[PDB]
Design a protein around this ligand. Structure first.
Ligand SMILES: *[C@@H]1O[C@H](CO)[C@@H](O[C@@H]2O[C@H](CO)[C@@H](O[C@@H]3O[C@H](CO[C@H]4O[C@H](CO)[C@@H](O)[C@H](O[C@H]5O[C@H](CO)[C@@H](O)[C@H](O)[C@@H]5O[C@H]5O[C@H](CO)[C@@H](O)[C@H](O)[C@@H]5O)[C@@H]4O)[C@@H](O)[C@H](O[C@H]4O[C@H](CO)[C@@H](O)[C@H](O)[C@@H]4O[C@H]4O[C@H](CO)[C@@H](O)[C@H](O)[C@@H]4O)[C@@H]3O)[C@H](O)[C@H]2NC(C)=O)[C@H](O)[C@H]1NC(C)=O
Ligand SMILES: CC(C)c1cc2c(cc1OCC(=O)N1CC[C@@H]3CN(C(=O)c4ccc5[nH]nnc5c4)C[C@@H]3CC1)C(C)(C)CC2
Ligand SMILES: [Ca+2]
Ligand SMILES: [Ca+2]
Ligand SMILES: [Cl-]
Ligand code: NA
Ligand SMILES: [Zn+2]
Length: 806
């Protein structure tokens, strides 16, 4: 109950909302049925439209008009945006040539250049090029400022998750807004688009920019706009706020457009009906910039033009029905559409079994357009698991499709030709970024980057210290002329040991054998040299990775590879080797098929043992440095050391073998050599972060050997592929992956075929950033290069997506 009998006279778009039951006059009162009786009349005027006409010029101020063309309007802050053009001979901002903004050119009293976030719903990246002829204001921002070819959204590529990621820097799993609809079991409550629960603060985690600003004494424009307030009124209200007195004027402002998303849902991304919404957005941009130029702010403010996600072609007829797969379809609740999330209809049904639902949804139809996963088995790059609001069962839906429970759910709901939500590496989901202003560079293109990075930059732009977030602060310093943040490398926490030969073979009782007794100081001082790190500059190109937690580990050197061997996990944390373009693939000689050799540098009590593998009927083993890539028959003996061994399910050894035997060589041929770093990951609580030893849920039977949840590889070469990887003078090129260490290949529907028909498609789906691997290992890579740290941070955030060109 609001006593809605106060009045908005003098309070229109007041910046501190008032506490019940005083009625409200802020830009959100409509949305709480809480506006003063006179809000419309005083605050939402519309008389005479939005533009000055020649015969309104110098008019006498009439307070009823939506905007003014009177002589006093400039200093009242309330002219129509085209006032100076119509009435004072000025040009529109879009008609002026752009000129570099080397310094903020601001009115006296401005402590810092304001930021204006101009956000557009459903603005797909390819609109920047494909609609360029009808978006002249946007094209000018783009080409005069700083722009990326596209900006990657977060998964799922829905509205609320992505806008709240822009606000916080966080993955949805950490901010809490994990879809446009959710159920939280702890609250026993649901969050929905229509309705009131979504206003409760308990849904919204992390610290959004407007709160970060406020706490640090920067004032924020009440960000968000009741949907019926027209765009023109939003722009005029921003422009008015910008005329406030110095002590009351905000430094950060937001504008949001529901277009082009709204039309895209109806017409598809490239419907002929989409040209008009794109014109109308561009005209709103022009009204802002014209209005800024009137207030002499057009070379003062930083403007960000940003989208939340793209839009794909999706129609009712491309719907898969869980009723064509499940007999038990009424015992489940589906969150449906461009993703699926399944839970039990009822907590009291102990006959509900996730294992059987997953099995019934796995590879059941030739062209099945969705793939089921337990959330911990989703690709790690999605960072979509560590929230109680994310259901254990997930369906990743193919682009262009929907999933639904039963056909009645669709025809008793074709209405629509566009949707979004799919995998955030899909091209049609990509969105836009442009920054224009004194703090952004001039006419600069930057590489694609993820929207999780922007919160840090927006903090940099306002002089704020960002709250902890999932950006990598400094990775977007190349967007900025100044205000850059100067990050430093984390300190190494554990220093390694460098063990020499300390154990005699007979001290080991590991149940390992090798046909190796088959026995000249030409090649004896030589192998001594190799075990002391004579070849280390070949196989360790960017320095050793730094260990950023407390542990006990050893550096081991070999002719062909170098490893950091964990005495706690009994296996390498990392293994580093270089494969030149010229290198050759060999086979494991027959006599050496089951050979495992004790490492006389490493105690038996810190070694794996072959007997546990024998007794463990599910678990086999592989090697991190592959025997197939040995430089010589003699060096190959090093690859069978028990310290190079790691636990592998037979199903996973198919993947791993194909990667090591076939793909590494292919990459070296294509990239002119590659440096590889491989190793295990343990993420049993699926939080994206390295497990401690007390979090491991599975061991090789009868032993303390922990079973990895994943295996990673980082593959680095020269960006200039005319230079070989081991003699690169400039920028690097990386691709990486985090493969799930699974006891079956159910994920790959074509897995009974040869590895050449399915392993690469799996690896592509499990592409990763080096930063993702950092979080999962507590390692810090690329510590010694000739490159600036900022450029290295950029490299560590790169994702190789395998999509074609936008
Ligand atoms: C992406 O970036 C983010 C941001 O940096 C990273 O997330 C952080 O990771 C930290 C490590 O997991 C985590 O730190 C923990 O915080 C606990 C207290 O946190 C509360 O206060 C903060 C501060 O304001 C607040 O942000 C938190 O918010 C979470 O929960 C609220 C309420 O539910 C939500 O609104 C909000 O969305 C947010 O949810 C997300 O995080 C939680 C985890 O906190 C998840 O469970 C959710 O699913 C969701 O993902 C909190 O309100 C603190 O209590 C923890 O301390 C334990 O461990 C330390 C180790 O140092 C130890 O000293 C203590 O003993 C303690 O143990 C005791 O508790 C254990 C667990 O209850 C118990 O088992 C023991 O037996 C002990 O009793 C810890 O410090 C930090 O909160 C989050 N921050 C955010 C915003 O998520 C994220 O890791 C990055 N991701 C990647 C991939 O890099
Ligand atoms: C989430 C919110 C806190 C937020 C943060 C930030 C921005 C904008 C922000 O919110 C803009 C805004 O005013 N609205 C957000 C959108 C929702 C979704 N919707 C719908 O019901 C809706 C809209 C489109 C849809 N597509 N598919 N389902 C849909 C559902 C109406 C509703 C309109 C209001 C900036 C980017 C400026 C910075 C950070
Ligand atoms: Ca076995
Ligand atoms: Ca973990
Ligand atoms: Cl959703
Ligand atoms: Na399979
Ligand atoms: Zn939408």
């Amino acid at each position: 109950w609001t006593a809605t009998s106060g009045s908005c006279k003098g309070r229109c778009f007041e910046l501190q909302e008032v506490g019940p039951p005083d009625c409200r006059c802020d830009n959100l009162c409509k949305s709480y049925s809480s506006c003063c009786h006179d809000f419309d009349e005083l605050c939402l005027k519309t008389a005479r439209g939005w533009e000055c006409t020649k015969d309104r010029c110098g008019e006498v101020r009439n307070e009823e008009n939506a905007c003014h063309c009177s002589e006093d309007c400039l200093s009242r802050g309330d002219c129509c945006t085209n006032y100076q053009v119509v009435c004072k001979g000025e040009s529109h901002w879009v008609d002026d040539d752009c000129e570099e903004i080397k310094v903020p050119e601001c009115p006296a009293g401005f402590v810092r250049p304001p930021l204006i976030i101009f956000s557009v719903d459903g603005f797909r990246a390819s609109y920047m090029k494909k609609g360029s002829k009808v978006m002249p204001n946007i094209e000018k921002l783009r080409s005069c400022g700083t722009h990326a070819p596209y900006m990657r959204p977060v998964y799922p590529t829905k509205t609320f998750p992505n806008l709240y990621t822009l606000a916080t820097g966080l993955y949805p799993e950490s901010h809490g807004i994990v879809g446009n609809s959710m159920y939280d079991p702890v609250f026993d409550a649901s969050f929905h688009l229509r309705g009131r629960e979504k206003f409760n603060h308990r849904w919204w985690g992390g610290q959004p920019l407007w709160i970060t600003a406020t706490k640090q004494g920067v004032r924020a424009g009440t960000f968000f706009w009741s949907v019926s307030i027209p765009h023109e009124r939003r722009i005029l209200t921003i422009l008015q706020w910008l005329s406030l007195p110095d002590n009351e004027r905000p430094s950060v402002y937001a504008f949001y457009s529901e277009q082009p998303d709204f039309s895209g849902h109806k017409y598809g991304p490239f419907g002929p009906e989409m040209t008009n919404p794109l014109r109308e957005i561009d005209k709103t941009v022009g009204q802002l910039m014209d209005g800024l130029k009137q207030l002499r702010l057009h070379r003062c403010v930083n403007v960000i033009f940003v989208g939340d996600h793209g839009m794909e072609d999706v129609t009712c007829d491309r719907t898969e029905f869980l009723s064509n797969y499940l007999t038990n379809v009424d015992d489940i609740t589906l969150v449906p559409g461009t993703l699926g999330r399944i839970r039990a209809k009822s907590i009291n049904n102990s006959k509900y079994d996730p294992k059987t639902i997953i099995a019934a949804l796995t590879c059941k139809k030739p062209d099945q357009h969705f793939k089921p996963y337990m959330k911990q088995h989703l690709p790690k790059r999605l960072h979509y698991a560590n929230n109680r609001r994310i259901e254990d069962i997930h369906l990743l839906v193919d682009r262009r499709w929907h999933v639904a429970r039963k056909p009645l759910d669709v025809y008793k709901k074709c209405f629509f030709q566009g949707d979004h939500g799919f995998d955030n590496k899909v091209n049609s989901m990509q969105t836009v970024f442009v920054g224009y202003g004194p703090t952004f560079k001039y006419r600069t293109k930057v590489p694609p980057f993820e929207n999780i990075e922007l919160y840090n930059v927006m903090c940099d732009l306002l002089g704020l210290k960002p709250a902890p977030n999932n950006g990598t602060h400094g990775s977007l310093n190349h967007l900025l002329r100044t205000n850059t943040f100067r990050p430093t490398m984390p300190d190494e926490v554990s220093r390694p040991n460098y063990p020499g030969i300390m154990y005699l073979q007979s001290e080991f009782d590991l149940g390992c054998t090798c046909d190796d007794k088959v026995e000249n100081k030409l090649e004896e001082l030589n192998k001594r040299l190799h075990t002391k790190g004579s070849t280390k500059e070949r196989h360790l190109l960017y320095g050793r990775p730094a260990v950023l937690y407390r542990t006990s580990y050893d550096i081991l050197y070999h002719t062909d590879f170098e490893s950091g061997y964990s005495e706690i996990f009994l296996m390498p944390l990392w293994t580093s080797y270089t494969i030149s373009k010229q290198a050759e693939v060999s086979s494991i000689p027959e006599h050496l098929t089951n050979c495992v050799r004790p490492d006389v540098r490493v105690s038996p009590g810190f070694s794996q043992n072959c007997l546990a593998y024998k007794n463990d009927k599910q678990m086999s083993y592989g090697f991190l440095f592959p025997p197939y890539l040995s430089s010589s028959p003699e060096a190959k003996y090093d690859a069978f050391l028990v310290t190079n061994m790691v636990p592998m399910y037979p199903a996973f050894k198919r993947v791993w073998a194909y990667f090591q035997r076939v793909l590494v060589k292919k990459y070296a041929s294509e990239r002119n050599g590659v440096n590889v770093i491989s190793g295990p990951i343990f993420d049993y609580n699926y939080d994206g972060l390295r497990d401690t030893e007390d979090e491991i849920k599975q061991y090789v039977e009868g032993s303390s050997i922990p079973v990895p949840t994943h295996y990673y590889s980082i593959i680095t070469s020269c960006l200039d592929f005319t230079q070989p990887a081991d003699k690169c003078d400039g920028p690097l090129s990386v691709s990486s992956f985090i493969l799930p260490h699974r006891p079956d290949n159910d994920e790959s529907c074509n897995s009974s075929e040869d590895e050449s028909k399915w392993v690469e498609e799996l690896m592509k789906m499990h592409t990763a950033r080096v930063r993702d691997i950092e979080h999962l290992t507590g390692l810090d890579f690329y510590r010694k290069t000739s490159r600036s740290y900022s450029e290295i941070l950029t490299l560590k955030t790169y994702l190789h997506t395998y999509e074609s060109e936008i």
